[PDB]
Symmetry: D2
């Protein structure tokens, strides 16, 4: 027994209707995993579930009842071995802008979806995973969350997003410590800039220009490359309590 | 050579107790005028009276309270400093005996410590941006309190660690946001300090904890946190950084 | 198309006669890679090269001419696509001991083997890789070095080792920036505690107790688990300029 | 009772003939401390030591005998309470240049002066401070070293400098741990960009342009501002085992 098996195990992916979550769903399905997609986007989520043979659950990650429903769907499908938190939003607003201070509700909403939502999915999924029998490598399950390089390199306009993502990154260690007796590993990925619908409203010129600023490779990341690192986290028993930058070595500048 | 504390106004959240109180005392001794913003009327009004400053009852999570506290400061004089010390430190495991960590406890910790700190920053920064620059160039300086839990989160600290990591992580983008306004933004990450936050931890356990600090082998004094605040106000090159103030301790899981 | 191929490409592994380097050589060889092992240990290195169908070079990583010889053996064998720096030593001595200060030569030697030696191998290998045609994914090659959690969590007695490994970790970014125009990715792994001959002086009992301190899994790392991460680095085109802790979420205490 | 006294105590400052070391010397003297300046620069060191009423010792920080002489001069002068490591060099060379790889000697020399040299001074000064009676605040002494933002943000051409300064940063914690029983605090300052002779051969336009990149204040740091932070570290009993960026919030880009 060298690593946790993806084949025939269940993986709950928030934000699974789009972008990195969708790419993760595709790779885990190709590996024989069974996916539960938890997202607000019912049309895309149901469609992807049909394409992959998974289950779609309409889920606002910030709500207790929705996290419960998503986790219960996964445990009904089979043995829940992985949570991948990809649900997130990335608004921009300066601390002091042209119209006065950053609106409070905008900061709160960003924190609520990205940080409180991620914790909400973690706590519910962890409670369920703790009831599993250990796999042959010892794990009851593995939790992967998505931060961002903004946790470390926050740009002008990203105070809220950075706060939320640094929150996600910072809680990796205490959660790993909390769940060590349950044999659940806890990891975070901090992506740089990836080609997903999160970038809709960045004109194609500006996207290509941003790709060109990445040291190597000089392009936006593919969702599959995120997914590849998720799989490695699942498969490597020693990866725990850590945040991994996945960013072509970029360091984001103020603008 | 540096921004003068003397004669300028300093808004200190959590200023009725502990680190905020200590900061208030030192800033007053340096000739600053303090506004103490806290939930605690009785302790806040006493200390403000003692220091010849002003107390404002302020829940840092509330927009209207933030506005009132900043307004008190701009009335008193030129607002040159915000020090965010308001915060709470609950303990609860991700998965407890009785089920998962309660969601509301997590949300409450995040709301006081992170959303509250941001709420004070945004309002205070808007007011500071209207100031004329001091002779050293600053319109103002914002200092926030994270914790070594931002980096060394222990068992039961997921909510506190998330909140404090948030505070630490936003230091840089807020510094970047306010660089055109000539406002510096810094964060102190304290280790373990002797304040009422340790009420409940019995004395033997506090002494044992002090003995785990490499040097000095004791709990931090509020004046020591306040010394670092004062350096941040006085040093024109400190911006966009998080400083651990912890006697070199690194917190273990338990 | 999706990642750099290990099969039929050449991998130069310093410290390849033992422990993490040897485990990396085994995994890369299983994946069809051709290995050059570079090590001081002639007997073990030659025996492992023979077993894996690779090449051994007796090489002190601190010497220019040894790095040159190791790189020349690799380029003879085929297309040099990866360097893995595992050559290292881990002495212990306090800054101020019972008998006086930490000896200067012990500090210097640690830094020379672990930090100067790693850079020596990198610069020579990178110069070779820079002359490669790019692979389909765009990389001319990929460099992986070994730091340690001691870069961040240095214990009493570890000033020299910590300095050296923090140096390895900190140079990852500028070297990735230097080699971005050459399309060479540069990454660092920071292992926690792994079961290798580096632990020879630690009694079995103290190894087992230290294993029990690792949050999860409560054991020492396997060389294969280090190797798995090296493979991920090679295969993921977005991993660049980063240091990855591989440590079961442990944080090292002073003692 | 609140903090260690600078007045009438002795401070050993390496690189004290120029720039940050010189500014430190001035500020500590103005506060009533007695300085020993340790530097290669005999003429400027002797002249400044005279100007400040202290002592100069020609000291190559990489040599054991020089460290010993410099520490001896300090303990003859009075009670040695602080060491400030400012001796350093910052050459530039790419990992792979136009003409071949980065010369090995250039990397080794940078590491030798900046890292080995800083450790050499620490171990000798620490052994001498360990023999002091504690000050009323409890310290026998305090050690301050100079890293750089290049420890974290290393630029193209800075592999050697970044390695050296990340080494200095990363050894802060184990050395603090080593010296805790001796009551000696150990700290590091990581400066951004400061107006000193280190920038000689950067033309004034390039210096002014780089100052304009500092988010706030939009200028180069003054040596006095470095020195102010050194004094805070001496006077704050709770600052230990930590690295402090002093940089106007800049993050250095590849070029
Ligand atoms: N694309 C990038 O460049 C990038 C870089 C760094 C980090 N990230 C983060 O990666 C993660 C994935 O984002 P992405 O690029 O795939 O963006 P995306 O917009 O394509 O996908 C995000 C998904 O999250 C869903 N979602 C939003 N709020 C939700 C909520 N309350 N409950 C449930 N689902 C919700 C959305 O409907 C969407 O389907 C996010 O956390 C994002 O912040 C992205
Ligand atoms: N004492 C320590 O060991 C330690 C260590 C690291 C960080 N901290 C942090 O330092 C800061 C100050 O803590 P302290 O030790 O002085 O604790 P404390 O309990 O003595 O003081 C905190 C103050 O915050 C006030 N407060 C709580 N919620 C508030 C709200 N919504 N609005 C306004 N005021 C509110 C309290 O009434 C109190 O007066 C906190 O952010 C704390 O998390 C403390
Ligand atoms: N084992 C652990 O717990 C652990 C943890 C963190 C980091 N590391 C690091 O991992 C790497 C591999 O260590 P390991 O555990 O496999 O130890 P190991 O002692 O089994 O293997 C180290 C190899 O490096 C060789 N070597 C030493 N100096 C050399 C030199 N100048 N030139 C060429 N070869 C040299 C040795 O002969 C040996 O074969 C090292 O850099 C080590 O510092 C190990
Ligand atoms: N100026 C900056 O922008 C900047 C930024 C970050 C870090 N630093 C670092 O600050 C420290 C001070 O640099 P500075 O700006 O004052 O430069 P500087 O060149 O003005 O002063 C450095 C001093 O170090 C002495 N020195 C060099 N090698 C020595 C050796 N082997 N032994 C003894 N002394 C030696 C020099 O003769 C010189 O007087 C260095 O460690 C430097 O790398 C400087």
């Amino acid at each position: 027994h060298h690593h946790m098996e993806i084949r025939d195990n269940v993986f709950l992916i928030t934000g699974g209707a789009s972008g990195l979550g969708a790419g993760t769903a595709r790779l885990l399905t190709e590996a024989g995993g069974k996916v539960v997609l938890a997202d607000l986007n019912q049309d895309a989520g149901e469609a992807l579930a049909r394409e992959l043979g998974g289950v779609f659950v309409r889920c606002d990650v910030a709500r207790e009842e929705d996290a419960q429903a998503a986790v219960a769907a996964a445990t009904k499908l089979g043995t829940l071995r992985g949570l991948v938190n990809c649900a997130g939003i990335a608004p921009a607003a300066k601390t002091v802008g042209k119209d006065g201070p950053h609106p409070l509700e905008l900061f709160a909403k960003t924190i609520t979806v990205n940080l409180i939502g991620t914790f909400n999915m973690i706590r519910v999924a962890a409670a369920a995973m703790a009831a599993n029998e250990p796999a042959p490598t010892g794990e009851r399950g593995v939790i992967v969350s998505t931060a961002s390089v903004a946790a470390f390199d926050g740009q002008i306009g990203q105070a809220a997003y950075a706060a939320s993502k640094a929150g996600v990154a910072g809680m990796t260690l205490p959660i790993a410590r909390d769940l060590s007796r349950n044999a659940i590993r806890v990891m975070t990925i901090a992506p740089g800039i990836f080609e997903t619908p999160m970038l809709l409203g960045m004109p194609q010129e500006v996207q290509d220009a941003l790709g060109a600023m990445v040291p190597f490779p000089p392009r936006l990341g593919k969702p599959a490359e995120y997914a590849m690192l998720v799989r490695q986290i699942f498969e490597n028993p020693m990866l725990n309590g850590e945040v991994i930058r996945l960013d072509g070595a970029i360091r984001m500048q103020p603008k």
